[PDB]
Amino acid sequence: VRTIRYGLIGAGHMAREHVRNLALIPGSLITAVSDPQPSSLEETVAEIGYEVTTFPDHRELLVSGLVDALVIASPNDTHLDILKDIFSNQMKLPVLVEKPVCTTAAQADELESLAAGYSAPVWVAMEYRYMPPVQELIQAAHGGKLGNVFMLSIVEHRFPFLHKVDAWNRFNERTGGTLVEKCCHFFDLMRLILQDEPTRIYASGGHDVNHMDELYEGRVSDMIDNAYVVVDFKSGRRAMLELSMFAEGSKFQERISIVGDAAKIECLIPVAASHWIEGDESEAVVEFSPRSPLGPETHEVPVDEAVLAAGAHHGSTYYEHLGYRKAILGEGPVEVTVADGLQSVRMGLAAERSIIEGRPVELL
């Protein structure tokens, strides 16, 4: 072993996944949980399965001395404030902070300065990359099987935003926008696969279908439910994101395609069985499509049954935690830094502005 005491700031749905995944990793002990909602604590405690000290407020937790490391899985607009507390705390602990790291540019601007002066690891929890199918595509791109890389397409086709606590995931004011909230993953993936930095974004999107029967003090959701985004990079590579939140019918929730000048590669990621028909479970597919001699190659990508049953992310949360652990113990780097978190968000924020004011947006 070699034990790490973990504290959870925020004890909702994703917290419980972090729990189930920490359960598979020896050396991992949860010792403190913070949540302003007792019903959330009761359920999260039940899931953990052992005795832990609870707090309604994270400040009491920070100075409790029960924890070697933190996990933040509270609503998006809370994230910066909690971090500012962690940064100004005497103790100075590692943090895994759920995405989005930020929800506005004011925050991004502020966070950027503070994080520079902090001495403990900060990892932004964008796990998508450790999905085994996506891992293949990343190594295939990086290692040269595609030749020189130019195009990258991501298509997400999925169900409407789920029902959460105090319905915080309904308004842009609280989420950063659909493209920040659900899409910072894909904007980071772009940077990772293309090995490049964005120069420009343009998007078209609407709120066309969803959440039209929900009032919250008389108001309907102001958020996007579909969009097309186009990103240009400093070397002239280009990428595109397509989103529909009313395409749950799709066997495959994500489709990721990368074209280079020697070959093309695509992956098809199924819907989580927890969201699909029971029995009609599908396995993920990767297709390698070379130009040079015509002859595409398809193959299923399997994971571990336990790791996959640990969450709704095809085992990725597990690996994410293996990474975080290593970094705490100085046996690996932070793979997903604040910087990364901030680019992913500024990318979404830019995209949101573009839909609003019918112009592209420059990135710095």
Add this chain to the structure above:
Amino acid sequence: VRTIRYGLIGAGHMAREHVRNLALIPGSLITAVSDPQPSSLEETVAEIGYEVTTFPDHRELLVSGLVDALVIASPNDTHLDILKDIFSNQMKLPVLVEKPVCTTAAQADELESLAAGYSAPVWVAMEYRYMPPVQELIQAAHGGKLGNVFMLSIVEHRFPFLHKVDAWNRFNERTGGTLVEKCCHFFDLMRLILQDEPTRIYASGGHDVNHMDELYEGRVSDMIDNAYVVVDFKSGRRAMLELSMFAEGSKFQERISIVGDAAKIECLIPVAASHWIEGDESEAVVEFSPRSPLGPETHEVPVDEAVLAAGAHHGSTYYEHLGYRKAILGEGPVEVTVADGLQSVRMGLAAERSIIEGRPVELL
């Protein structure tokens, strides 16, 4: 029966497909072929299989008195000139004119005026819609199985521009640009499926891979080989086109998806036999993906063996000619008018400007 005498102005590769398809349609007689290149004439005649009168120049053909209707399958920048001759000819005849109808805005502007004062049918040969797979998508969109329609995605993944006669298809000056030349069909498809008009268009693209090694008086092809295009419509529907001319590896050359608020529908078009592996004759698929009860429905869509062997367009050219026949006999409408042809071109021209400038462009 009722026999129709057809004249072909231009006798290259597509002309021979027009021939092969006219061969399947009873009542179709070719009587005159025009081409400045006798190599082209002798092969096109060989294909026809019977005796016909040839001309080097289309003007002699127009006043030959052998023809009830015309087909234009010459290089793009010739198209307006030939039409001006047809429009001013004493005997005013029906015309099927290959796409692009135009190559510049000056021409679009001019053609628009002239074609209004011409009294014979003018049909722009964008046959894509009659591909049986695509037909299902259009009826499904129009007829309501998708609910209200919002998104349309087109992915073309194909080979570099081919070697043509006197190599006319290499410079923007002669083609109108890649987005005009090879993409006007998809811009028309958008208008057709969405049943709407574009308000705005934006694209990112480059010349990144292809034709770095053909010189024409010392100069390299100045044409795009990949792009992402985004179109917004007057009702808030949107569409996006992805093009790579270096993705010949792809089993499926086209992928079309349409998302509405009850269901999604996709079609996959294989590479034409003549361009694919020998033996690997894959068929097109259509997948219906409802939201309401999860349960996707897939099925292969066949074309007739002869109709499929008659062309490189999944049988579409045949149906196109069934329509053109009716219009010649004044028993049927022009399904694809000059107006349609002109929007398709202006859409590409707009997209070309957008890549160049860096801003979206307004459409009227």
